[PDB]
């Protein structure tokens, strides 16, 4: 007997810490023809994230939030590093200036995929996921 | 110069679910927020928009949410001061650290003494310590001549 | 898909011709004839079906020429063979001769009901069926 | 891509067992987010069974796009389906 | 998940590929040069493996790069430099084979250029989906004459694509076979066909060491060292043979080796504080170890540039080289260097893609022992009021369910049918546990009213006025909550029952009919009980996958639900013809059977 | 790792076909109720 | 995402049209810029 409404999350993948739903539960749900129930119970309720993605360069890690643009003012308008080279320009935490890397949008992908991007880039092999 | 512009842009507007009877209301509802607010794609401040028409594609519903989405063609009127050429503004604040102007009554111009050559000298009046006339090398006073013309860096420049 | 009609769920009672013809008054209201006969084609595939039942070749199965979702005459060959062998063999329920028929039944009425049955009980398109076969092989193995 | 014309539509006129569930689900979500109800309520509270009452009378918006395997798609009004 | 989140992106495709030397430089924000991790002040060393611009450590340390706390900063990668570059541990086999087929004197492949051009025409024509056309190129039978043959083949392919123009499994099933044949072919030739000479072979090791003896004397008529020379050799091969390697993979410089590898932020690299012992992790341990070897190489190459002197110098240089190569190899692959590596935290069969991606632990899912009950329904599942209070789902508040939700928040999160807590339109969560009923009533009255203190509070994207206030409410007698049983073999094993909330017991109750479906015995096996949160999920569970619609197994038509032992024996005894009832028993037994009011509609 | 290095060398692109690939990137499946897109 | 060519007189006439179409601070500043550009 153990009922889990909400609780701690995982260090790396932001999963519920160690009930098990998958690899056979997925068979059942995509058997019933329940796309939305699968995408709910697996992606929504386990680990949900809104991660920024560079639309042009098509990658998810080389993005960075802009720093010290002005006073309180407006929103920190995120930009990209790998796609980069007064309004448009921006600095870094250490003070390095950049320009370019404007096409950045919101996508929704599970935190485990972000962890996979991490452990994958540590191997230098990286996926460039496109967005429309 | 001809620093005012109008550009017919196409945006991806999220029609809230509460306005699924008519889209126009939910379009205006977030268009009237963008006015006088920086639309960074075009790198300027939106001033005007009309001819609100949607490319009819039966606006699409997000795959788990009730608010729809659609591409809409609307024409903005951004003011672009991208160091094009000479502009002009009315002075409001003056100091021996920078000069303060308002162009179009709206947009600020902070011209530091760096971009000003030394030849112009500031007199410090006895009534106000900070506020005073920034006299030119010729000797002319600028407070009666509120209209000051210059060229832009991005910020202004009085050095030639 | 597998000679379409459906995986077992909606195909059990096709072989039960005695049962469908027994009452037949509830099945027409279950299929909602007045709404189905409107927008689907009825004459074309039904006409070509008989010509496909001509034993010589050069007339393909009705399912191949005419899709079964909208052409309400198109149905698998063995289904036609079986419904006709029942209608001719043991029609003790189906009345006839034909003059005494026009009170409550008609051979043509029943064959229309059965055509409508096959039509309304196709596989629901979009079904993921790979895992249906996967699980129908995993379950009885264990 | 192509948007197949209204004259020639090859998909099934039946509201498939899936389009019914998702139409009712999205209509329930819409009505739950303070959308207009197109049919008189009799006191039902759940923001879903209202959508069942709408669908029983075929008074519902939200045409569906059926994506054929070519890449093309049909546009079916929920009034138009059987 | 929230329903107000407006995400407009639609992830349309992923594409893999190597990340060159210039991109790992552009994406990186800081460099890690210092093998020291923590100083006496216990704060992270600057530029260190735990840099605050790398990833914000705990204890309210704001990221130096993004100036936002751990709640909002997605981590920023880093890079560590090495002018050694060692070859990649994965393509090491494929790199070594492509080297084996190299011609060092020829600077081409050992193959005949006409065969390489044949395979190039093949991989060109398979591009646009031409299978039999891919195989027809070979119906030609015939260096200058070989050059003419190459022109015949290329013009055949050009005309074929011209006729065709005006991915699928079969295309890929043919590409993979043709490339396997190509790689069987190029590894066969020992003598050059263009150079006619015999390039010096190379012999490998499992410990990542490669080289072999020089040319032989008869062929002259016609061991381990630095990886830099083989790197430049492969770069030369790649730049001189462009089209075939372009189709096969224009650029192939930094695929096989690595010049500056990246570090993940602290967010993915924690230190599990298991009681008192503090080991950072094997990952940061291995990164620190390669960092030590890197600085050792730096010092040693300095010593060598400033200088049997060359003998010992080169010996020690190559030994430090091989330590660095073997260390990177031990990092990315744990099957070498007799410490879990990246490939071994993936391929572990206990790691990713089976325990973290396909099957994830889930929120809002109870689990308990079942016990049988005949009184409820064939649909319904009894849940004690404990599961009533402990499973909640969000609900926007409208005009006609406002009474239900106000009353729910009044009852509170300790009394069924109370509600759990409120979610504002902007997105915060106002709890309801510590509040007192005066505060709860004051809050529940002002629950349906525009409370955002602006037309668009945070910024100028104005849907924050259209959203509703979401009360998390408890389950109630109509909510549809999935049941399951592991192992769940076939689809009738995971169904969705309506919940009916019983008082008293501490064991959920379901009817006997489902006992045949779940393959359960009510003897101690327990069942996961989920709750579909969003309304789309509960709608589809109610209409598509609800229990009463699972009357037919998928294998054969034969139905699986239906009554069991007691009901059927009493059936033989009730329908039997020697039975008789007076009026009282008839009416009473009938009404016990029907029980309309609990079901309704009549 | 084997299928991974193979897909990394060649750099092969899926649209997003099967429910498993659709699941790893977090979108809904193409089967079932996720087959069509529903518009206003 | 599109851009086109434009002259100043089109911009001013459209400023007029936008003063006309949707009817506090915003239109105040727009009258300010209208009074500054003309004259
Ligand atoms: Zn990048
Ligand atoms: Zn940061
Ligand atoms: Zn050679």
Numbering used by the authors:
A (entry chain B): 1029 to 1046, 1054 to 1120, 1128 to 1174
B (entry chain G): 3 to 156, 167 to 172
C (entry chain A): 1063 to 1158, 1162 to 1207
D (entry chain F): 61 to 142
E (entry chain A): 1 to 142, 172 to 195, 203 to 258, 321 to 347, 354 to 411, 421 to 451, 461 to 724
F (entry chain A): 1642 to 1681
G (entry chain D): 12 to 34, 44 to 59
Study text:
Transcription of the ribosomal RNA (rRNA) precursor by RNA polymerase (Pol) I is a prerequisite for the biosynthesis of ribosomes in all known eukaryotes. Here, we use single particle cryo-EM to solve the structure of Pol I from Schizosaccharomyces pombe (Sp) in a monomeric (apo) and an actively elongating form at high resolution, showing that Pol I cleft contraction upon transcription activation is common to both organisms. The architecture of Sc and Sp Pol I is similar, despite poor overall sequence identity. Nevertheless, we conclude that the principles underlying Pol I regulation ‘activation by contraction’ and ‘hibernation by dimerization’ are conserved among organisms.
To determine the structure of a monomer, we stabilized Pol I by crosslinking with BS3, followed by quenching and size exclusion chromatography. Comparative structural modeling reveals that, similar to Sc Pol I reconstructions, the cleft is extended in monomers and contracted in ECs. Consequently, the ‘bridge’ helix of subunit A190 is mostly disordered in monomers (poor density despite higher overall resolution) and forms a well-structured helix in ECs. We do, however, observe a density that we attribute to the ‘expander’ (‘DNA-mimicking’) element in Pol I monomers. This density is located between the ‘protrusion’ domain of subunit A135 and the ‘clamp core’ region in subunit A190 on the upstream region of the active center cleft and appears to prevent unspecific DNA binding. Due to flexible connections to the ‘jaw’ domain of subunit A190, we refrained from modeling the exact residues of the section in the Sp monomer. Location of presumed expander density in the cleft is comparable to that observed in Sc Pol I dimers, while the element is flexible in Sc Pol I monomers. In contrast to Sc, density for the expander element was observed in Sp Pol I monomers, hinting at an additional possibility to prevent unspecific DNA-binding to Pol I monomers.
